[PDB]
C-alpha cells in the first residue's frame, strides 16, 4: 500500500515549500553521454573518500613533538626515543583493528585524486573547453590543482618519520631561507624559531584538517555550480548545434550511471588498499638530524619540483657581502609555471584574436599548434618527473648516476622541441587521413582482379554516388569518420541462445527484426530533427 | 501554499514514468537481491567502521598478588605480592627531589 503512502507524503511537501516546477526543471536537465566527460567526477569521488577516511584518522592521532620512549607491541623499535606523532601513527597501524587498512586507503585515494585532476586538466586543455564563456572555471580549477598539491604535501609530513623529515628540512626550510630580502624573517615566522622548533606539527595538523580542505570544498562547490548553470559543452556530430544539448535526462538514466560509477571507484580504491603496501612507517625510524637514507623521494605530484632542483646548475651571486643561493632559481621558476598556467586562455585569446562564445568542442587533430604546445609541456613534465628518481633508475638499470644528471640537463631543452615538431606533423597527417575517406570512401580490404588483369580495391561510399560509380565528395563537419567495415554492421549476431545451446528459431527472427527496426527508428528520428533544424 | 495543478501533474507524471518504465517492479528476483546485497554491505561496513574502538572493560590486565584482575577492581593500594609494605606518604612540593616522604 505504498501508492497511498507516497501520495500523502508528496502532498505534505508541496503544500509547505511548493517545489514542483523547481524540481521538475532539475529532473529534465540533459547531459551529453561521452566517456571523456566522466573524467571530472572521479576526482570528486576521490575527494569524498578522502573526507570519510580523514574523519576516521581524527579519532586516534596526536600531533605533538613531545619526545617519548616507545615501549609498545612492535618489537624492533622497543626502547627507541621518538615523538608523540610517530608513536600515535604506529598505534593506528598496530593497535587499532583495521587502522592500517584505513590509512592505506587514505593514501591511495590521495594519489588517485591528483592523477584524476591531471587527466581532467589534459582533457579540458586539448578540446578547447576553456575558451568562452568558461575562463573563470579554468582559473578556479587551476587554484584547485595547486591547493591539492599542497594539501597532499602537508599530509604525509604528519607521521614525522625519516623520509618526511628529510623532505621537509630540504624543501620547506632550505628553500625558504634563500629568498633575497625576506629570507630569514619568513623562516622564523613560519617555524617560530629555528628549523625543528616545537609548533610545526600542530600547525601543519590544523592547516591540513581544517583550512585547506575548507577552501577546497568551497572552490569545488563553485566549480560544480558554474558547470551546472552554464550547460556543459558537447562535441560536433549529427543533430548537434551551437544552441542545443543532446544526451539523456537526469532522471533516471544519468543518476543510475553516476551512482554505479561511484560504487565502482569505491570498489577499486578499497580493493587496491588491501593488496598493495603504501607508506610503511615502521621500516623507517623517527626523524633524526644526523640520519638519512638513499631514496629521498616525494610523492609523484611533487616530483617535478624536486627534479628541477637536481638539474639546475650551481649558479650563485655575492653582491656587497650578501648571498643569492641556487635555491632561488627554482622558487622563481616554480611560480612562473603557475602564472603561465592560470592565465593561459587570455594569452591565447590575445594571440589568435578570437573570442566568439564557443559551445562546440574541437578535436585535437584540428588544432595543431595547441596540440603541439600541450605535447611539449607534457614531455617537459615527464622528463622532470623521471629526473627526481634518477638514483633509483641508475641502481635498477645499469647506468651511471653522473650520466643521468647530464642526460636530464641536456634533455630539458632538446626533447620538448622534438616533441613539438612530431606532434605538429602527426596532427596534420591525421587531418589528411580524414580527407581520403570523404573523397573515395571506406576501404573494405577486398581486391577484385578485373578481367584484363587489373587489381583494384572495393570502396564503400558514405553518401550519394555519381553516374559513373565514383562517390560524390563530402564536406568535413568536425565529426569522426568510420574506417572499418565491421563498425558499419558488416556482421550479424551469431545466433540467439546461451553459450552452449541455441534457442528456437522464431525467437531469434523476432528479436533480430525488433532490433533492426529500432535502429531504423533512432536514425530516422535524428535525421528528421537535423533536417528540421536547418530550414 | 500549493503550486498550480499543471506543475504538480507534470512532476508526478515524470516520477511515475521513471519508476514504471524501468520495469523494476515486475522483476521480483533482482529487486530483492539488490536490497539484500545493500543491507549486507552496509552492515559489514558499519561494523568495520565502528568495531575498531570497542574494548572489553572486564579483561585482566592489572598484575596483583592473586593473579591478573580488571582495572576497576584495583587501585594503588592493592598488594602486588604477599607481605608487601605500602607506606602512607605525604606530598609537600619539591617536584624533582623526593615529592613523597614517610
Amino acid at each position: 500500500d505504498f501508492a497511498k503512502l507516497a501520495a500523502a507524503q508528496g502532498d505534505a511537501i508541496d503544500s509547505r515549500y511548493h517545489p514542483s516546477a523547481a524540481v521538475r526543471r532539475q529532473l529534465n536537465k540533459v547531459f551529453p553521454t561521452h566517456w571523456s566527460f566522466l573524467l571530472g567526477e572521479i576526482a570528486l569521488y576521490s575527494f569524498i573518500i578522502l573526507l570519510l577516511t580523514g574523519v576516521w584518522l581524527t579519532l586516534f592521532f596526536d600531533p605533538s613533538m613531545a619526545h617519548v620512549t616507545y615501549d609498545g607491541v612492535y618489537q624492533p623499535l622497543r626502547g627507541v626515543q621518538m615523538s608523540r606523532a610517530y608513536e600515535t601513527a604506529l598505534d593506528i597501524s598496530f593497535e587499532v583493528r583495521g587502522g592500517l587498512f584505513v590509512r592505506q586507503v587514505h593514501h591511495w585515494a590521495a594519489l588517485m585524486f591528483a592523477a584524476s585532476i591531471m587527466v581532467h586538466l589534459a582533457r579540458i586543455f586539448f578540446t578547447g573547453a576553456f575558451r568562452r564563456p568558461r575562463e573563470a572555471n579554468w582559473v578556479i580549477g587551476s587554484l584547485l590543482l595547486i591547493l591539492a598539491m599542497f594539501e597532499g604535501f602537508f599530509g604525509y609530513s604528519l607521521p614525522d618519520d625519516l623520509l618526511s623529515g628529510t623532505g621537509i628540512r630540504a624543501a620547506l626550510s632550505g628553500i625558504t631561507m634563500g629568498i633575497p630580502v625576506i629570507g630569514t624573517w619568513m623562516h622564523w615566522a613560519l617555524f617560530g624559531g629555528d628549523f625543528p622548533g616545537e609548533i610545526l606539527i600542530p600547525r601543519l595538523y590544523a592547516l591540513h584538517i581544517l583550512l585547506i580542505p575548507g577552501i577546497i570544498l568551497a572552490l569545488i562547490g563553485a566549480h560544480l555550480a558554474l558547470v551546472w548553470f552554464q550547460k556543459h559543452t558537447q562535441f560536433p556530430g549529427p543533430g548537434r548545434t551551437e544552441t542545443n544539448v543532446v544526451g539523456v535526462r537526469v532522471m533516471p538514466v544519468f543518476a543510475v550511471k553516476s551512482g554505479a560509477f561511484f560504487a565502482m571507484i569505491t570498489g577499486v580504491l578499497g580493493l587496491m588498499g588491501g593488496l598493495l603496501t603504501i607508506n610503511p612507517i615502521w621500516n623507517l625510524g623517527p626523524y633524526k638530524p644526523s640520519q638519512v637514507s638513499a631514496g629521498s623521494q616525494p610523492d609523484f605530484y611533487m616530483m617535478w619540483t624536486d627534479g628541477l632542483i637536481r638539474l639546475w646548475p650551481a649558479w650563485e651571486f655575492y653582491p656587497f657581502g650578501h648571498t643569492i643561493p641556487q635555491g632561488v632559481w627554482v622558487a622563481v621558476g616554480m611560480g612562473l609555471v603557475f602564472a603561465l598556467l592560470i592565465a593561459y586562455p587570455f594569452i591565447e585569446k590575445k594571440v589568435t584574436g578570437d573570442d566568439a562564445h564557443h559551445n562546440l568542442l574541437q578535436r585535437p587533430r584540428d588544432v595543431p599548434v595547441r596540440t603541439a604546445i600541450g605535447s611539449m609541456a607534457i614531455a617537459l613534465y615527464l622528463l622532470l618527473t623521471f629526473a627526481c628518481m634518477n638514483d633509483i633508475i641508475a641502481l635498477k638499470f645499469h647506468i651511471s648516476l653522473n650520466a643521468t644528471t647530464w642526460i636530464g640537463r641536456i634533455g630539458m631543452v632538446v626533447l620538448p622541441a622534438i616533441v613539438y615538431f612530431v606532434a605538429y606533423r602527426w596532427a596534420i597527417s591525421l587531418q589528411r587521413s580524414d580527407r581520403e575517406v570523404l573523397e573515395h570512401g571506406v576501404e573494405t580490404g577486398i581486391i577484385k582482379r578485373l578481367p584484363h588483369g587489373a587489381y583494384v580495391e572495393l570502396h564503400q561510399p558514405l553518401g550519394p554516388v555519381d553516374e559513373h560509380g565514383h562517390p560524390i565528395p563530402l564536406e568535413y563537419a568536425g565529426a569522426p569518420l568510420p574506417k572499418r567495415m565491421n563498425k558499419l554492421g558488416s556482421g550479424g549476431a551469431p545466433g540467439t541462445g546461451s553459450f552452449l545451446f541455441p534457442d528456437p528459431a522464431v525467437e531469434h527472427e523476432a528479436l533480430t527484426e525488433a532490433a533492426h527496426a529500432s535502429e531504423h527508428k533512432s536514425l530516422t528520428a535524428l535525421k528528421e530533427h537535423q533536417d528540421r533544424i536547418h530550414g | 501554499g500549493r503550486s498550480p495543478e499543471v506543475h504538480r501533474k507534470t512532476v508526478a507524471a515524470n516520477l511515475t514514468d521513471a519508476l514504471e518504465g524501468s520495469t523494476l517492479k515486475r522483476r521480483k528476483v533482482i529487486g530483492l537481491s539488490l536490497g539484500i546485497g545493500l543491507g549486507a554491505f552496509g552492515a559489514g561496513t558499519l561494523v568495520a567502521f565502528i568495531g575498531g574502538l570497542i574494548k572489553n572493560p572486564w579483561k585482566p590486565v592489572v598484575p596483583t598478588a592473586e593473579g591478573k584482575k580488571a582495572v576497576l577492581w584495583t587501585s594503588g593500594w592493592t598488594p602486588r605480592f604477599k607481605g608487601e609494605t605500602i607506606y602512607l606518604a605525604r606530598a609537600t612540593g619539591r617536584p624533582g627531589e623526593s615529592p613523597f616522604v614517610k
Binding site: 521538475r24 526543471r25 529534465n28 | 495543478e5 499543471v6 501533474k9 507534470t10 512532476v11 507524471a13 515524470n14 511515475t16 514514468d17 514504471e20
Partner: peptide, 24 residues
C-alpha cells in the same frame, strides 16, 4: 494553458511531453 478539467483527461504519456515542452 490547460484547465483543471483537461489535466484529468490526459494520460501519463502526454503529461511528460507537456512537462518537457515547458522546460524546453
Amino acid at each position: 494553458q490547460p484547465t483543471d478539467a483537461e489535466l484529468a483527461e490526459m494520460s501519463r504519456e502526454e503529461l511528460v511531453k507537456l512537462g518537457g515542452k515547458i522546460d524546453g
